[PDB]
Amino acid sequence: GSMQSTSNHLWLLSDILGQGATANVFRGRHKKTGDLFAIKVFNNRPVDVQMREFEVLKKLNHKNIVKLFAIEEETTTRHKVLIMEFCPCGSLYTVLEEPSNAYGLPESEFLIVLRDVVGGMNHLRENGIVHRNIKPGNIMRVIGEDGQSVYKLTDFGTEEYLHPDMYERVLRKDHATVDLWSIGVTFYHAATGSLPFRPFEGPRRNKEVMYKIITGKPSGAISGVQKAENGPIDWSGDMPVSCSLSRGLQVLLTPVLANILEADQEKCWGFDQFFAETSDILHRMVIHVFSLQQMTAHKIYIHSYNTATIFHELVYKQTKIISSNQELIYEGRRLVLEPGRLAQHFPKTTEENPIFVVSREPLNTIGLIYEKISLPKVHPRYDLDGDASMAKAITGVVCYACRIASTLLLYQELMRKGIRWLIELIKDDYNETVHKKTEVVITLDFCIRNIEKTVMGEISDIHTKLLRLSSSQGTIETSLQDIDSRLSPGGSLADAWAHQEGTHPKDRNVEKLQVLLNCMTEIYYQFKKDKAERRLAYNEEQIHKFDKQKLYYHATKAMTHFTDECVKKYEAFLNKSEEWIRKMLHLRKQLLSLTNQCFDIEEEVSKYQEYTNELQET
Amino acid sequence: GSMQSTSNHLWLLSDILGQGATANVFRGRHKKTGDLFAIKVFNNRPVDVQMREFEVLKKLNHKNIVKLFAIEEETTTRHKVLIMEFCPCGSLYTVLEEPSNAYGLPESEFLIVLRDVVGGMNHLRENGIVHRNIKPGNIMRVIGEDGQSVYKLTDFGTEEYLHPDMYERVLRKDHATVDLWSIGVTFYHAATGSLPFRPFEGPRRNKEVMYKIITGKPSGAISGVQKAENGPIDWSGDMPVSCSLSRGLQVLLTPVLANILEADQEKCWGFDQFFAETSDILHRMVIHVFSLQQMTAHKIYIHSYNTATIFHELVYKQTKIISSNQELIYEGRRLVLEPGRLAQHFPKTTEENPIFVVSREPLNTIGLIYEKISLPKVHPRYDLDGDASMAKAITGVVCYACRIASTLLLYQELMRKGIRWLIELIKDDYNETVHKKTEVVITLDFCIRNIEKTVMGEISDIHTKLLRLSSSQGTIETSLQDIDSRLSPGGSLADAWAHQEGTHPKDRNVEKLQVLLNCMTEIYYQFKKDKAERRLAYNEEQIHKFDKQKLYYHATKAMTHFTDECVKKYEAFLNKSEEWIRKMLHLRKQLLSLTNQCFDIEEEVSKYQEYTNELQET
């Protein structure tokens, strides 16, 4: 294999990173240092319209823009090459081909994409550049020095991403929102793993159904899918259920998408509003909350400067528990947020260490809501392109199952923890009120009896009325004994079942699934190599056919384990939780009542304390 | 490349897994399924001494023994091949070459190795086989179906691992412990990343110093290292400081090693005792405990059936806090273990969620104790063998730094959590005693004054003596106000500094280090490839020299970040903890005193309650 070069760099033609009509991108090295760079080489005026536009870029300096170092002359010809920042990881496209992201990026990653695309976008605009076609292949990923992805825009100056006016194909007239469209599609694709507008078959074969979908899209819809050949379009303003993003994030993103995926440029958002709206999301912090009675996890997207009041409102939006019914638990103890306490001063939370919320009012136990996705059928006919894409799809289904199994395990672990804490909490209450009582029994038994016992009627009415109180306290004692016994080891309120039901970390169900998944992923990546390599030799051919069966046998094993082990035991744990919750609410409601009687007893005794002493002559 | 085969399998000669004097091991496939297997082929009597010993093995069935499926005839010759279980991961040797394990295996992995080596060993013995030479290259690793390693013995029937009698080289006379020796060396190597007996330079060049080390080893020593040329030997009965294993595990393992690394076979352990002793370790569960005043994490190795009593004893061994001074905290609240409560019923713990222990008695704040390891110098002379081994070594140092930085971050995170909990705990105490007090003030202010106020001396002495009590309670009130103000936001006992000092997860120091480490590890693995490939072409040669500089620049960047950021801020946080601890102990000791006065007041008032009422004529 051989190489072109310039004064300072050199590169294999085999080591190509990208191909456009205008130019090609290879990875090469600086000859003096050995350092990796992307070399952009143009295949072809006016001569200096380019040296100028090249110069403008060489000046651009920004975190979210692939850097243009220098411009050089290839040695063989006086052709211009651009030396650009090499990004070993590739593009957002590469990321979304990972079977792991078949149903959307992980939330944190999606947020980085959102941030960086928006940042790069702005920078161009600030400098007045318009990037006509933003798409995942345009958006380069790099590992930052802190290990987090940094996304970077390159190649400024695809059907599925072109605006309706653009899809037709008259140079856009005279000047951007059209950019917002492809950003709209890009973000949706990153959020869900899918293109938002999908004629049956492909957009490619059905360019016409596709334009009909995009133009005739009702307002608010963010997707339209044709599920059958020549069938109708299903519209939605919602994220698909299979999407990983939290309800907290979904609720914020959806409106941004609806408003930048608008056909009439009359009512598109306009950039600034888009910048303002996206930044409002990006500037929020996340507080993790888990709803114990609903068996649901939540992310609350809240500004640093927002109050607890707003926090309760946000929680209410996702749970339907009104502010005043919201009872908070954190790290074993009650959390009491003063209304005006800023979110920046709330205690630190994670998905594994959330703030729990409980109500004294009945809620339906929801649990995790997820798509039921079954394996596609494997087509026995051998095909290097077909099998690669099928391998991707089936591995995608198993990863999803794996992701859901992990969430299912988390939900049960949080439940077990939440329940443990709440029981010790109720237990405190029982002891707080059981103290008070013994402390007021002290007045009946010590004062009224013993005080007036010391030496016409009303007195006959007082000693007897008081007896009704000790009588009333006796009704209290036996109702507390009943609650204590319920809170104890034998009790109807016991923890035990939660250790007996569902699945536990030590079961290693997630790990068992990942092992199977890793087997499928090696095969998928090989089918990726088998595709690129256009024909296999006899043995390799056979081996490829074998592994096509192995994929399926691995995928079936996984789905069976998922449904019969993970889902089954999970549903058993949930149904038991439903019952334990109802008993708990009823118990707390009795104890409350026993607590209020204690106050009502306590204060009448607090009146007759004085009645012992009359005025005296003197 | 071409292949031998048999009726049912075939294999490249390039795809070799192992080479001994007697035979070779390649990886091949079943021709009908495509499945991977290890093919052992013998290079050479009596003819059937072998078909018999082959048959014995084909019968062996055990989790920790590489499985022998069948015996077949190679096609070209009637030579015998063994078809064996293929283990894609390789051997314990491969694992210990990973720069990640330069200073020993992670604790969990070490325990699996221990378990599996012991299990396989026993199985052979149960069947009466003796494996003369156990070593990491003998011990095969496989990923189990739950994702955990399973280790498996193969090749039954190295200098560094041979017993002193064996090192000499008379067929061992007539018959095992000699096996125990190599197990001794193997476990030590797995625990520390190093051979226990090391002449300066290598064992290879110094076969003679090596035998002198092993034979002249004082009893109890588990290692002897010659650190200078012709220098003396440093002996130890302890694990090196750089070893990852917990003190809890070290304390148990060390005696096993001392007793199976014994020269006089008179006083070696003998297998059964070894089996009993190792199993005693393997059958223990681990309870994670964190000592708040010492800033130390601990693993308590305890049987399921052991009592809390034993638990306290074990904790005392590692902390020097006697049982009765041990105060336990778990998930925000006090933990009170009944003496006879079984460890199996203790609450579940992890390193991130330990039981905290505190004392009311002063302890030195120790923190984490770790080796200071600096980068070796990089030798500028180009050498494919030399550079590979150097790349390994320098990457090993950085991984260690990374491992320590992670532990350092954990220790600070646990401190912050522990302190948070303890403060709410002390806070409870303040409120428990501040209740009691107001509850007894009720008797002074309500009863004695008001009771005898109602209508010769001693009475003159009582009203005045009582005044000394309200007087005494007034001394109490202002001392509580003082403690409350200390426990509040302004207080000398505040949390604030802990958020201001040390390093936090959001700093991403561990991630910054891993990124650097990953760069070094790609280079190391390439130098591994450059070594195997005996000479590099001019460019590759240059590129290899460049990256040899890149390693160093990456390693320096890492060490600088480690010492100047991780270690520095950590040491600042620790020094502040030292001070906060002392204030806390002093505060708790005052509150205790204020709590006891409250009892002493409370009970004298409890006597004069009766003194109000004399006997009456009637």
Ligand SMILES: O=C(NCCCNc1nc(Nc2cccc(NC(=O)N3CCCC3)c2)ncc1I)c1cccs1
């Ligand atoms: O698209 C284009 N330019 C941007 C992309 C090519 N440019 C660069 N690439 C990288 N590094 C890099 C590393 C690994 C993989 C890849 N790419 C892929 O894996 N891909 C591409 C989509 C098919 C999958 C790229 N560094 C810097 C650049 I500048 C162009 C199209 C037409 C003209 S320029």
Ligand SMILES: O=C(NCCCNc1nc(Nc2cccc(NC(=O)N3CCCC3)c2)ncc1I)c1cccs1
């Ligand atoms: O040592 C020996 N037999 C046991 C080892 C060879 N046998 C097997 N190997 C594997 N799989 C496997 C996979 C990847 C790597 C490797 N090995 C290595 O990476 N190594 C070897 C130490 C040098 C590093 C092995 N499967 C099954 C077997 I059976 C022998 C020595 C002399 C005769 S037999």
Ligand SMILES: [Cl-]
């Ligand atoms: Cl480009």
Ligand SMILES: [Cl-]
């Ligand atoms: Cl072998």
